[PDB]
Amino acid sequence: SQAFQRQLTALIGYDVTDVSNVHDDELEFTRRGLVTPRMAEVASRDPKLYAMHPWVTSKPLPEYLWKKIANNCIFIVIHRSTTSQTIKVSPDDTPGAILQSFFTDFVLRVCGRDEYLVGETPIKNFQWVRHCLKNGEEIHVVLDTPPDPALDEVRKSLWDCDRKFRVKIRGIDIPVLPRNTDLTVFVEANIQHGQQVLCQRRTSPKPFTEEVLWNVWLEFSIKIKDLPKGALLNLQIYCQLLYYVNLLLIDHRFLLRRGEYVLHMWQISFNADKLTSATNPDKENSMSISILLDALPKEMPNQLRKQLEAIIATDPLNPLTAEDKELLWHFRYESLKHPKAYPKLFSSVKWGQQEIVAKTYQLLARREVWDQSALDVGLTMQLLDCNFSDENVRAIAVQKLESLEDDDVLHYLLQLVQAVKFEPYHDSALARFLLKRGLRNKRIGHFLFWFLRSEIAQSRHYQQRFAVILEAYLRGCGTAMLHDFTQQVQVIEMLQKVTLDIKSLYDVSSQVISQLKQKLENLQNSQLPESFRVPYDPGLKAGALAIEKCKVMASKKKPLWLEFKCADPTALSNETIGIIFKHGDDLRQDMLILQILRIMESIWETESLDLCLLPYGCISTGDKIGMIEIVKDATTIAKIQQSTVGNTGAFKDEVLNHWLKEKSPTEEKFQAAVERFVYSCAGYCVATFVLGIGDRHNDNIMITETGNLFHIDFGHIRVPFVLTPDFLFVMGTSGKKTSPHFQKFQDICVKAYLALRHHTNLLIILFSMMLMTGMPQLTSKEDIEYIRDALTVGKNEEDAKKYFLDQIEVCRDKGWTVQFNWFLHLVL
Ligand SMILES: COc1cccc(Nc2nc(N3CCS(=O)(=O)CC3)nc3c2cnn3C)c1
């Protein structure tokens, strides 16, 4: 089993047995603590359903999809060898019903995909079916034998200390210091709990040298017993802020931190990295600090009610005053009757006092209203952010998540994984939760893998914790998937090498095109796996490369344009699988943005609205490097312009409509392309405005020959958004005018906008989290408070409607101005 731990390590990209960077045994302890949850989920999953991983949903079929059906008669073409026959099926009839309705043990696998139509669920509740109906595609399935469940086989007293807590600051040491002669530095020690500072003590400013000694006893104002579980000893060096490092004061065994510590610190407000209990691995170049330290048990007046309700009604980002907190607390039993008051109520708690925390735990023991309340993801997410370090509080959040069906877990998987960074300890209810769902479902497990590996590869701050979690998963996912992952990682590594090697050698000369195709030839020949799963789409199995179609794109970061053949013989079309390999950008920012877009879509699904967004696949695999899905038949908006007038930025209003008339043959399809455009344009206008990324160069905007608009390059990020005159022309308008299509556009936008405001809290918390865990450069107070204004928090539906309509009018008044300006900067 020695080559087994080796296998996991090479699959993880980090050695979880390496104890070189620890000052305790929390990590190793967590490895053991996860064994039970690991085996408890492996021994309780249905082998058959787990092997076929049916992808289903319990949500009602949207309205725009019901009208796609004729007589409640959905046609399903079945194949078995070379023959084939169609069948009329009831949307409410099970796959089993269809089976007996066919013969009148075999299962219905989807053609070309590793997807299965199995289980006791209506045919209308399969994602693949809903996908087909939406795209007007025809459902084709092949009849073959169920996968062998054998292939999944798995390898067999603190409260008696009244003393004021204190820490001795021996000094700070650094091998080599910056060439900035010569500043002064002091050490600032904070006792934190959920980004809430309980006490703060500094040292005296000393001359900045490679060795600074203090030997100073910093005595805090907080007693030892009043120390809460999860409290952090935050040590920071100023000059302003240069270094930081954290130390849990209460360990994973409820023991008060004791003894000597030499901690290596991180170099440089609301960043999630600043919360980590991990120390800097680089011991030879990093700043170090030396400290010294020397078990934990387990009727209202009318006016006041109005006041409390008003408080409870405010948005998540609305600051609580001292008065507000005192009201919430004093009336905590009434506040408990409102689930939406929980985040605010638990922010009113003084965790710096044992007596209060005790009363708080008494309160939580009375969870009847919370338990019986319906799941509010936005509300549940709020309790898992940086503002809550109490495991009891956070546990009741993870509690409500338990009722999520695999469908919704996939919706919030990425950000749930990111929320692990907010956990005080490596072992958490959230961590075990992700682990559980990952083992219960292959699709969730697949993406869990890549999301964790994403962080492990380019995050020294949390790679250790995530490595321990990933290892736990890999020891239960099964032999089959362990093999898949292995193949996937192999091909990725090989391709990333080629990407970097190519980038080294603006024009794409022949010497590079030859070298690329040359390199790809060497790999495909006895060096590359014959087949592998597409990481951003586990259903697809890629095969051999199409070297003829492979190229280096004309961008300054020289991304690889790759094309594969579907390794599945039963595949219908002969289209290639397109993947863009790129180094230079942080694709983690793209993942989050795209994930948010998918969330905005499902939200619109609840309102029976359908904006035709194109949230393509984008997986971050390493440092400034990852893969992208290639959308077929798509070109840049700016490129459609460059066709007529390339060099100069002399943009013309009509080109777009011409380009569409050209790429559609029947004129009927042209109208379907225009309508598709009007919707896709509306959605991307609304979604982009809310996220504050609407001001882009139309080179970062693309369109499908079918009229499907969609943005790209979100790493890179005046007008509210992009509504240029050429788009407007396709809508049948130019200046002081209108159109049957423009009236439509304005209608769909207001619908979409008002629909998102119905999930304000949920968007706010996701946006806030996005900045803190994914965008190190965008983590200020005002950076997050943008989305409040964007969603017009605390406004009438009418006002908001007009507010956005004004934003639209701003695009009309600007015309090509901002685009032309983009043309001067980006182009020149
Ligand atoms: C100038 O732009 C061009 C030119 C030619 C083809 C394309 N191809 C694409 N480019 C991008 N961007 C994001 C990923 S990138 O940074 O590696 C490349 C840009 N996304 C795309 C496609 C096709 N599908 N999707 C989702 C773009």
mmCIF file of C-alpha atoms in Angstrom, residues 1-12 14-17 31 155 471 475:
data_model
loop_
_atom_site.group_PDB
_atom_site.id
_atom_site.type_symbol
_atom_site.label_atom_id
_atom_site.label_comp_id
_atom_site.label_asym_id
_atom_site.label_seq_id
_atom_site.Cartn_x
_atom_site.Cartn_y
_atom_site.Cartn_z
ATOM 1 C CA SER A 1 0.000 0.000 0.000
ATOM 2 C CA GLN A 2 3.096 2.189 -0.229
ATOM 3 C CA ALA A 3 2.582 2.915 -3.925
ATOM 4 C CA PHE A 4 -1.003 3.744 -2.966
ATOM 5 C CA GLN A 5 -0.206 6.717 -0.736
ATOM 6 C CA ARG A 6 2.165 7.673 -3.549
ATOM 7 C CA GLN A 7 -0.751 7.536 -5.977
ATOM 8 C CA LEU A 8 -2.923 9.772 -3.802
ATOM 9 C CA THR A 9 -0.070 12.255 -3.391
ATOM 10 C CA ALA A 10 0.433 12.495 -7.157
ATOM 11 C CA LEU A 11 -3.329 12.847 -7.586
ATOM 12 C CA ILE A 12 -3.471 15.575 -4.941
ATOM 13 C CA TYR A 14 0.625 17.660 -2.116
ATOM 14 C CA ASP A 15 1.990 15.211 0.456
ATOM 15 C CA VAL A 16 -0.459 14.871 3.353
ATOM 16 C CA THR A 17 2.078 12.757 5.244
ATOM 17 C CA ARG A 31 -7.113 12.542 8.687
ATOM 18 C CA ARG A 155 -9.583 -0.506 -1.160
ATOM 19 C CA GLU A 471 -7.412 12.558 0.420
ATOM 20 C CA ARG A 475 -10.160 6.928 -0.338
#
